[PDB]
Structures are given as C-alpha cells and as structure tokens.
C-alpha cells in the first residue's frame, strides 16, 4: 500500500536529502522507501527495512530485474517507535541516517542521477513528516 | 508547468503544516500551491501569488467552476528573494503564513478535509524545500 509520493519533474538527485519521520504499526511486516527514475518509474534506489527479520535490505530495480542486496548489519529501529530517515545523494552515494547517526552508503547504480524525480513510500510505516530539501 | 506534486492517500487536512521554500525567476509571473480533493482532483485551495500585479489571489475550484476570489490586500513577497510559504489546515480554515508572519485565513468550502490527498505547485518557483509535517 502507497503511503505517500512525491514527484519533482527538474530531479531530485544529487544534492538532495529527504527526511522521513514516522513509526511502525507492527513488529511483523516492513516498509520501503524508493527513488524512482523516469523514464520506466526503475527502482534506482530501494531502502527496505524488514522488522519480521531485522535487516535492512537495499537494491535496485534496473532494466526489470532486482540487482545484488546489500544488507546492513545492525538494524537501528525499534518497531512502534518514532524514527527519522534521511537520505542524501552526493556524486557518488545515497547516504542513509538513522536518528541522526550514519547507518550505510549505498553507490549509485543509476548513474542518470537527474532523472530521480519520484520518491515513493510504501507499506507500514505511520507518516509524521516528509521534507525533501535541496542541500546543494 | 508542474514543479512539485505530493499525494498522501490517507489525507493531509486537518491538522497537517505544508511548507515550501524557493524564489520566483521573474518579477513577471506567478505561482501557485494548490490542495486537491479526491475523488475528482478538485481545488480545495487555490493560493495564487501573481507578481506582475502585486497580489496574491486564493479561491477553490469546485464543481467545475472557480468561486468568489479572495484577494489579499499586502503583498509580501519580493521576485527572485527566498521565501518560506506555510499552510497549516485546522478544522475551519487554511492558515498562510509567509516568511513567519501570518498573512491571510482561508476558511474551508470543501469540508470533506479528510478528502484532501494531493499538493501541487505550478509556474514560476524555483524550489528549495518542500516539508509536509503532521501538526496536530
Ligand atoms: O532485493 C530487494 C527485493 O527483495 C525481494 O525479496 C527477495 C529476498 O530479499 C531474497 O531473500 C531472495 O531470496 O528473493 C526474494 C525475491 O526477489 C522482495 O520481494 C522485493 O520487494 C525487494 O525487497
Ligand atoms: O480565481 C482563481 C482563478 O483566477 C483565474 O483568473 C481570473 C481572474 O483572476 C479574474 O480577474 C477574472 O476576471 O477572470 C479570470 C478567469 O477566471 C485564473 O485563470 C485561474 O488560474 C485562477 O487563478
């Protein structure tokens, strides 16, 4: 289920950070934080924390089909409890935050980085805030 | 033309802050921020500042016709200077704050707040933020 989506035409990428505030509804099921790239709405960049094992899993979804994961060791959420997500995308990463601490950087594989114009969030998740905000 | 558009399916209103920061290109044109309703995409609230005569215009666009204009008297906004524009929705009215100070009240003419999904900002802002915060 879409819980909330974001589109800006000119690119959001790099040199943009979105700042998600919210909390799970259950300690059972997961949800995903996506970057989009037109044309195709291909997945550049997947952030799926899955409470059920806690793991967060990262990907892409490129020319219809899912790359390699890359799994973060800790697992830095607390299922019902409010959190903040921040992503960052330089040149190079998306920088992920958790509670202001880094947690993992994830190297572009979508290297078209100005056609990230869609930001999607999915499944449980309880949305307090969504800020999308040019860095520079 | 399209600069930004967000939907949050469960509804944004009431009780929801939208605040947007970023400069116009030209002292010649306009914007706007409106709030759509579901089903139908109509415009709940239409906020419409137009540069090239001083005056910011807001209405509702609601069973295929625009309502009575209410018209601002004060303009404070400055072409190509930043600016923050917030909208915070309470149980009565849309409330405009701009660069902090309170500048104009809306009161609602669609009621079905709950209904009111999706933003979007069109035409001459060059944006910076968008943070789309749960208020209370
Ligand atoms: O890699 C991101 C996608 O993973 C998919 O689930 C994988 C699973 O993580 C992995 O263990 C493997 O065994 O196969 C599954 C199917 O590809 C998810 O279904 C997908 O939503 C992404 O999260
Ligand atoms: O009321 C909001 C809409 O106004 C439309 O322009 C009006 C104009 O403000 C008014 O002076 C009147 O004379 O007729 C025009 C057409 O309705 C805009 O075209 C529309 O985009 C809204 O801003």
Redesign the interface.
């Given at each position: 289920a879409?819980?909330?989506?974001?589109?800006?035409?000119?690119g959001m990428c790099p040199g943009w950070s979105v700042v998600v505030?919210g909390k799970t509804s259950s300690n059972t099921s997961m949800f995903e934080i996506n970057f989009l790239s037109h044309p195709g709405d291909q997945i550049a960049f997947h952030f799926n924390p899955r409470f059920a094992s806690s793991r967060i899993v990262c990907n892409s979804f490129l020319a219809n089909h899912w790359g390699k994961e890359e799994v973060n060791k800790t697992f830095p959420f607390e299922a019902k409890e409010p959190f903040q997500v921040e992503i960052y995308s330089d040149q190079d990463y998306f920088h992920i935050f958790i509670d202001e601490n880094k947690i993992l950087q994830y190297k572009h594989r979508q290297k078209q980085l100005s056609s990230i114009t869609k930001l999607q969030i999915l499944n449980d998740i309880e949305?307090?805030?969504?800020?999308?905000?040019?860095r520079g």
């Open positions: 879409l819980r909330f989506e974001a589109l800006y035409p000119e505030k949305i307090s805030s969504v800020e999308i905000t040019k």
